[PDB]
Design a protein around this ligand. Structure first.
Ligand SMILES: N[C@@H](Cc1ccc(O)cc1)C(=O)O
Ligand SMILES: N[C@@H](Cc1ccc(O)cc1)C(=O)O
Lengths: 382, 382
């Protein structure tokens, strides 16, 4: 598909960015530079892919694509469980892609089927605040990890209420509703599970993945977003989302828009993947400690208790978590584990994980103070 | 539910209309006047009811309700098959109810699952034209059948593009999507038929009865329409429509609107019914002659051929069709059949049916000329 028209000044910068991206692409082809896709694989972020690995790898190599993660504001704080899909997104941002965190302002009212507006508006506000705060810390870490400035690197926070507040139903149905079949939607475990056992599925719940697909269409249209990264349970939604985006791009009625939105080549298609489901060996969900989430908000979970959660991670899982939840180069993680196995009881690896994650969420100062506290002769049980 | 506020002049007329309606209601209770519901039963219009017969009868007795029939403009002309659901609607209009023919301008693009916009806009225009023309002939017949003027009697033509062009999807999902379960929607023959055999069901097709339900909500809200009359195959849609309307009325967030839209009493609820499926004893669908519809448009089906269709109706079915497709009092139909059985070969009953239906669709002059032609010594085969 053709690039849209812009002014002469923006255009020059876009061309230079494309030239830079292609030098990067050739460096990857020659093996001088690791493809961010191969980084995803090496660090353990890839569970399921919508699109082949080879497809996604070559898209990532050849194009400075946009990617996104959606988050439904179902509570006033994010918790550490939310961090997992965000990490590969943050890596792409560090690498100079365009990366978006979409707040599901409208879609949280429908609710993602499993597997008051006063409060819901407050939650939206707080999630936006927290994502802005976290994105700022990503910038801090970008700078600390030696990544250079890049004009074409982009981050954003989008709320899907931007289109859902007024998006006509008729248009959605006409642009994608004829293309989407309910059999495949119904022939997916999440739907059959909730219908056979549980209290059935509402039309709104049934429609949720169509709305999430239209979200992706809106991000593709507006920001060139070709990739969705999803939580471990989002594979089905990503598959449906791809169908919705494809239908929408193929049904664009204006021939002038079709030049920009209708795919012309194989790599114009959208792609997605999901991150692993993280549990410990006792079955505990990552980010749950006792009957409680480990919140990013210090007013819900103290920094000390946030650090505590990570310092208590098992020796079995800690290397995997260093790869997933830090921006440490693999060589640095290898050296940490080398030190750690000299005497695991010292919890070198876990203190490192804690320091790195607290540093990302709460900053280096808070991280240092929390570490000091967790190295005192008494630290609680718990 | 309370009546909305109006000016002092309109208000007085509404009160008088209500007083007149209540005198009528009491006349029905005392057996001086036939309930229009019992007229429906006597003339053969009732197939299935959404709501009990007793419910619908008492609603009709006690309230000057609004009723509607929806027609999807899938072709440039209506045909005589369309007349069947319209006839009880026209009877209500004659009796002083409020009666609407809704054109499915937006919903024809989705298509009612079974059991170009240049052309589709042209079809919309032509259907509106034809319905205006037919409604005018209803007025003519109203006057010829001795019905007196009534300020509160009302007819209208509405196109659902009036709301569908801009109606936000989010609002529809929030107001009725949590209340509607896909199991009952899926556990209906039309859906299972088209999914098991046939090429499946699109999301748009699956959503069609929700849109038709919102249509009814819009007509309830705007015009006090509590009744839908449907074609023989519309029972499932009417049941779903009732659920959508109920959900919408119960979910109204504004307490000032709830006084008007949220039901307070048993008779505030909506109701519907369907008309019979008409076939002859050879299995031919009513209004199909050879492989062709009998169109209301003289440019597609000549008046002579329209009359011809009715004059050829069987002796077995003709009394039933006189009741369904004419405004003849039962006593008049009884006298016609009395004359007819003296010598059926003269086709007295069928010429009467033809005259009456042609008179409604094409006018008395065209009816007279066509009868003259069909009484010539040669009339064609066919
Ligand atoms: N469905 C995702 C969140 C999400 C919302 C909107 C989107 O467009 C994408 C993702 C979840 O709840 O886990
Ligand atoms: N579904 C009906 C037509 C219709 C359309 C819209 C309505 O709101 C009601 C009825 C049919 O095609 O037979």
């Amino acid at each position: 598909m053709l690039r849209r028209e812009f002014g002469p000044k923006y255009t020059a910068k876009i061309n230079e960015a494309e030239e830079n991206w292609q030098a990067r692409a050739e460096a990857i082809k020659k093996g001088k530079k690791q493809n961010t896709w191969d980084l995803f694989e090496e660090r353990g972020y890839v569970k399921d892919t919508a699109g082949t690995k080879e497809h996604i790898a070559e898209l990532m190599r050849t194009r400075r694509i946009g990617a996104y993660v959606g988050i439904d504001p179902t509570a006033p704080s994010l918790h550490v469980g939310h961090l997992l899909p965000l990490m590969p997104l943050f890596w792409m941002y560090l690498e100079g892609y365009k990366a978006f965190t979409l707040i599901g302002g409208s879609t949280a009212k429908i609710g993602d089927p499993t597997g008051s507006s006063s409060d819901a508006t407050m939650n939206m506000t707080k999630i936006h605040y927290q994502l802005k705060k976290l994105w700022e810390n990503v910038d801090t870490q970008m700078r600390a990890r030696g990544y250079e400035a890049d004009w074409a690197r982009k981050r954003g926070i989008v709320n899907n209420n931007h289109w859902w507040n007024k998006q006509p139903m008729l248009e959605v149905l006409r642009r994608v509703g004829h293309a989407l079949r309910i059999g495949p939607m119904l022939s997916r475990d999440t739907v059959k599970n909730k219908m056979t056992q549980g209290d059935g599925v509402s039309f709104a719940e049934f429609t949720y993945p169509i709305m999430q697909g239209w979200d992706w269409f809106e991000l593709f249209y507006q920001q060139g977003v070709q990739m969705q990264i999803g939580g471990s349970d989002q594979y089905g939604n990503i598959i449906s989302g791809l169908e919705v985006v494809k239908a929408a791009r193929e049904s664009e009625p204006d021939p002038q828009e079709r030049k920009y939105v209708t795919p012309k080549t194989a790599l114009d298609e959208c792609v997605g993947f999901t991150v692993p489901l993280l549990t410990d060996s006792s079955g505990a969900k990552f980010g749950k400690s006792a009957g409680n989430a480990i919140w990013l908000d210090p007013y819900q979970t103290s920094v000390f208790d946030f650090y505590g959660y990570f310092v208590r991670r098992s020796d079995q899982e800690v290397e995997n978590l260093l790869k997933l939840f830090t921006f440490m180069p693999i060589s640095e993680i290898t050296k940490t584990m080398e030190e750690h196995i000299k005497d695991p009881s010292k919890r070198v690896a876990q203190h490192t994980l804690a320091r790195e994650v607290v540093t990302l969420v709460h900053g280096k100062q808070e991280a240092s103070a929390a570490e000091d506290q967790h190295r005192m002769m008494y630290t609680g049980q718990m």
